Design an enzyme around this catalytic site. Structure first.
Site, PDB file in Angstrom:
ATOM      1  N   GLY A  30       2.034 -46.341  49.661  1.00 41.07           N
ATOM      2  CA  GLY A  30       1.678 -47.421  50.581  1.00 41.07           C
ATOM      3  C   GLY A  30       1.411 -46.918  51.987  1.00 41.07           C
ATOM      4  CB  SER A  31       2.007 -48.590  55.222  1.00 43.11           C
ATOM      5  OG  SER A  31       1.365 -48.651  56.467  1.00 43.11           O
TER       6      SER A  31
END
Length: 504
Positions: free
Chosen positions: A247-248
């Protein structure tokens, strides 16, 4: 008839090599034990001794007798393996005809559960099954010797003939692990799981300059000295085996590609309103959707999938893939732990827009915590990726300059703002130091990856908390306070000076 005399062979077990931490603290130690074997043909002449012998072996009287009787035509069986030398001398002192002994070794793990997965453990044959014991088995095991004994027609030992091959002792190994930091990481990860009601978790600390793994802990853990009841969940070296979409936490690599393209600078603005971006059928969505213009640091603070996607479309997926591959995401670590997972970094000749965007904000690739920590180590080490090591490094190898020093420094400053700036990851702040990092969400994993001191990095760290199910003491990202606590202690244990001077 069989020969009146024959020369039979017995292996001479080698002493398995000592494993220490980087400071020489013992982590795996070969402990003398005594194995007893017998010639059933001789035991069969001394049956009245059996119950005393069975008792001394900790075996049932009748099960013992059944075993000898069913093997009455054999000339060799093991009676028991791995008695203490004291227990052994007690059995030997019974003077039962046909009872013989072999000196062997069994492992003891002085730090126990604190370093369970990294050190691993040996099987009943004193062979590495898990962790470093497995990865370095051949190094640690050495080579058994062989000796000859003269036996008679019924297998009675008459005397020792000679040793035909001496045992080659196993070799010593000093890990990169610093037990002081490993204990701190173990304790804080355990506490974080309890307070967050989590299923499991991992924490990795790396020296960004040397590639050394200074700590690697997972929960649940186990005591390698007593594995009676150990459940398979606890045995799993999650840091090296669990794969997840990061993810981020990979946006900083997308940003590094953006700054290397010549097309982007930190003060650039991207309009991410209304927190979504339609690309054909597919909609890219931000988790928080309260933004319009963000600068590049803002895209990181707000975890804007939309913002990083617009940048990715501008620069092309190839540039992002290249950085991610070069920093080791989805790539072999080279650590040589059998069963380590590599995950996957998707590649294409023609990158569809959805695949470009999701790569840029961390979905559609899968990585391990070790890989994520190594990637952050390259960023922290001014863009130079040094090969990973689980063993003490004295001469630092060259690293590959994967990101230019200038781009790496710029991204370090951005990640410092992610931790420090308003709206950032408040509870990742490390008191007395400037720290840098990025949160993400891998039934979810909470991720935090970062490094410190932010302006002159020394240590990189990844925290993974798997399925938190209870409210902890602080609000916000579950993994952030763990990074804070562990980084605060680790920096001080390593005597790293604070970098938050009053303007000097």
């Amino acid at each position: 008839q069989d020969p009146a005399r024959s020369v039979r062979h017995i292996a001479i077990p080698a002493h398995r090599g000592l494993i220490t931490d980087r400071n020489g603290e013992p982590l795996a130690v070969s402990t003398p034990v005594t194995t007893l074997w017998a010639n059933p043909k001789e035991l069969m002449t001394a049956k009245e001794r059996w119950p005393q012998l069975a008792a001394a072996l900790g075996q049932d009287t009748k099960l013992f007798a059944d075993r000898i009787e069913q093997n009455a035509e054999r000339e060799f069986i093991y009676l028991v393996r791995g008695l203490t030398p004291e227990q052994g001398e007690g059995v030997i002192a019974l003077k039962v005809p046909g009872v013989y002994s072999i000196e062997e070794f069994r492992r003891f793990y002085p730090a126990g559960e604190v370093v369970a997965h990294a050190v691993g453990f040996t099987d009943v044959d004193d062979r590495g099954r898990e962790g470093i014991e497995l990865a370095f088995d051949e190094w640690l095991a050495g080579v058994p010797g062989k000796r000859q004994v003269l036996k008679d027609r019924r297998g009675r030992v008459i005397k020792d003939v000679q040793v035909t091959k001496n045992a080659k002792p196993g070799k010593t190994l000093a890990l990169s692990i610093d037990l002081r930091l490993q204990y701190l990481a173990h304790r804080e990860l355990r506490n974080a799981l309890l307070e967050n009601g989590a299923k499991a978790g991992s924490l990795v600390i790396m020296d960004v300059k040397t590639g050394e793994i200074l700590a690697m802990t997972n929960q649940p853990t186990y005591n390698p000295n007593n594995r009676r009841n150990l459940q398979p969940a606890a045995m799993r070296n999650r840091a090296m085996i669990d794969v997840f979409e990061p993810g981020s936490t990979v946006k900083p690599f997308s940003m590094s590609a953006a700054l290397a393209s010549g097309r982007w600078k930190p003060s650039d603005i991207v309009d991410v309103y209304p927190g979504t971006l339609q690309i054909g059928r597919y909609t890219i969505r931000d988790v928080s959707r309260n933004s319009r213009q963000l600068d590049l640091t803002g895209i990181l603070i707000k975890s804007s999938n939309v913002g990083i996607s617009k940048i990715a479309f501008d620069i092309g997926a190839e540039s992002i893939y290249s950085v991610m591959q070069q920093v080791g995401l989805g790539q072999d670590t080279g650590l040589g732990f059998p069963g380590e997972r590599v995950g996957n970094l998707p590649n294409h000749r023609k990158w569809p827009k959805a695949e470009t965007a999701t790569l840029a904000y961390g979905y559609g690739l899968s990585v391990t915590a070790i890989q994520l920590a190594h990637a952050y180590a390259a960023l922290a080490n001014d863009g130079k990726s040094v090969p990973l090591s689980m063993t003490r490094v004295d001469r630092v190898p060259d690293g590959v300059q994967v990101i230019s020093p200038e781009v790496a420094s710029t991204v370090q400053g951005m990640l410092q703002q992610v931790v420090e700036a308003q709206g950032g990851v408040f509870r990742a702040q490390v008191p007395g130091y400037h720290a840098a990092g990025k949160s993400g969400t891998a039934a979810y994993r909470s991720l935090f990856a970062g490094f410190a001191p932010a302006t002159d990095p020394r240590i990189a760290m990844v925290v993974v908390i798997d399925e938190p199910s209870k409210a902890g003491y602080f609000g916000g990202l579950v993994s952030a306070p763990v990074f804070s606590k562990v980084m605060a202690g680790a920096l001080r244990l390593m005597n790293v000076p604070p970098d938050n001077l009053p303007t000097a």
